[PDB]
Amino acid sequence: LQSTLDNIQSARPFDELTVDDLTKIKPEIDAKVEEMVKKGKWDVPGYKDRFGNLNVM
């Protein structure tokens, strides 16, 4: 767990990480998107809490 702390301090791509890299790091991130569309859960909540919808005026 100490190596994990040393891992995270110098491996923070908070401005340059790739979402496809997130697909690579976890296939679950890849997996959870397909059955989302097939089962019909087209609407995705959990966004307006962090980023505003950015509505024009």
Binding site: V19, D20, E34
Partner: protein, 37 residues
Amino acid sequence: MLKRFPTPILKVYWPFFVAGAAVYYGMSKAADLSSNT
């Protein structure tokens, strides 16, 4: 980025497409009838 996650492209968009085809058949004959060339 452009990672293609499948979404409805034709499964549910058929009615307007067949409406367009029904338009097309007749849509060219209207020009033929009113040629005026």
